């Protein structure tokens, strides 16, 4: 019944400040050490910072020395994460957690246990900014040998993310919607298509449906075939 | 600092076989060697600390071994749910505590060349910039490239790609990638090409259009 909740992620200027909390229970939070590990999506685990039981001792990563923070309030079992000059590396999903008790009541053992799911920190200038969706047509030089590939481009918004569903819901099978992509401007972009049979062109119309929930923006794009040549 | 080398970087495996990941220290960390297992969008889990203690709940075929500077974990009898990520962690000699690069097992199959499908800029966009589409789908196994030409000329820098995670039925993968010029430089040429490489093809397979074609 060991429980760790982190919150305070969200999007944060580069240069400016953001205190993560973490939110324990199920266990004896005063009794243990505890740490932060950060991770980049689809990147390797990095250790950030760790604090005794009793608040009395702290260690960080060389990259984070001197800019973040690791604290407690045992009374109200909840870890912190004060992180101050936040740099577009700093991005990452943050967990908080557990190490094991040690044999003497009183150091350090590294033997992290139990991890929450962590929080998002994405360190941009960006404002937020709905998608614009653009069709991914059907044509000769999308369309082989019975299959006809067809999609949307959801291109230029701010923050992650975009939901994308075809045909109100009702298309599922041949779906493919991609890892969305920052560019240089400081606004995603990703793909979702889908693979259907070429004889389907003409007697079944495909939309996207797609949703920015943070612009609170909804965009259902008609996606038709092209001739070509 | 202690570095963790794992090897192999990835691991292809089908139901009931055997998995072997090593996991190397760049010095001595006696027994202090943790195994994780991680789920995309789940925190890692726990499977095996002080090299080869099993954590409440992990059933018997994962079993962890070795000391020093070599440690394995090996899984017997591979079913769908152990396809995921693994990671070492040392706690011998901290801080700061150190993991390993982690190693990919994911599901083998026979190799599957990708089917591949372009798409222009649409009129729509191009009413300032242009974004030309690539699609690599459902291919196996996953390194794929993309190659992007504009009239001939190899282009650099200004295309991105995203892959798909592993199918759960068909056990492939898809890739899309994108060339983005302004409005300008794509009326400037003509010639619209993307070349892949795959192990599925005996040699690149390039798909083009001509501005204006489709």
């Known amino acids: 019944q060991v429980q760790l909740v982190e919150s305070g992620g969200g999007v944060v200027q580069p240069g400016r400040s953001l205190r993560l909390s973490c939110a324990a229970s199920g266990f004896t939070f005063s009794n243990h050490g505890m740490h932060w590990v950060r991770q980049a999506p689809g990147k390797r685990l990095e250790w950030v910072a760790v604090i005794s039981y009793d608040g009395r001792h702290e260690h960080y990563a060389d990259l984070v020395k001197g800019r973040f923070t690791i604290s407690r309030d045992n009374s109200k079992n909840t870890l912190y994460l004060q992180m101050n000059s936040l740099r577009a590396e700093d991005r990452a999903l943050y967990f908080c957690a557990r190490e094991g008790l040690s044999r003497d009541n009183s150091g350090f053992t590294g033997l992290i246990d139990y991890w929450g799911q962590g929080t998002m920190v994405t360190v941009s200038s960006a404002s937020t900014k709905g998608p614009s969706v653009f069709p991914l047509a059907p044509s000769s030089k999308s369309t082989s040998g019975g299959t006809a590939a067809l999609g949307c481009l959801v291109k230029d918004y701010f923050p992650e993310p975009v939901t994308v569903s075809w045909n109100s819901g009702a298309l599922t099978s041949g779906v493919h919607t991609f890892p969305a992509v920052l560019q240089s401007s400081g606004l995603y972009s990703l793909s979702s298509v889908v693979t259907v049979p070429s004889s389907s062109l003409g007697t079944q119309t495909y939309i996207c449906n797609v949703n920015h929930k943070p612009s609170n923006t909804k965009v259902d794009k008609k996606v038709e075939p092209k001739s070509c040549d | 600092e202690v570095v963790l080398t794992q090897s192999p970087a990835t691991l292809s495996l089908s139901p009931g076989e055997r998995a072997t990941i090593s996991c190397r220290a760049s010095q001595s960390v006696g027994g202090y060697l943790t195994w994780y297992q991680q789920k995309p969008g789940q925190a890692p889990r726990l499977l095996i600390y002080?090299?080869?203690n099993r954590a409440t709940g992990i059933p018997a075929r994962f079993s962890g071994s070795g000391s020093g500077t070599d440690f394995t974990l090996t899984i017997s009898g591979l079913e769908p749910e152990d396809f995921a990520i693994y990671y070492c962690?040392?706690?011998?000699?901290?801080?700061?505590?150190?993991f390993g690069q982690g190693t990919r097992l994911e599901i083998k199959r026979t190799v599957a060349a990708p089917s591949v499908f372009i798409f222009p800029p649409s009129d729509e966009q191009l009413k300032g910039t242009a974004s030309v589409v690539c699609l690599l789908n459902n291919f196996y196994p996953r390194e794929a490239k993309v190659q992007w030409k504009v009239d001939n000329a190899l282009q650099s820098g200004n295309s991105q790609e995203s892959v798909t995670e592993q199918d759960s039925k068909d056990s492939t993968y898809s890739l899309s990638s994108t060339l983005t010029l302004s409005k300008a430089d794509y009326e400037k040429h003509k010639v619209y090409a993307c070349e892949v490489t795959h192990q599925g093809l005996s040699s690149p397979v390039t798909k083009s259009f001509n501005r204006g074609e489709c």
């Open positions: 002080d090299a080869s």
């Open positions: 962690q040392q706690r011998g000699n901290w801080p700061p505590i150190t």
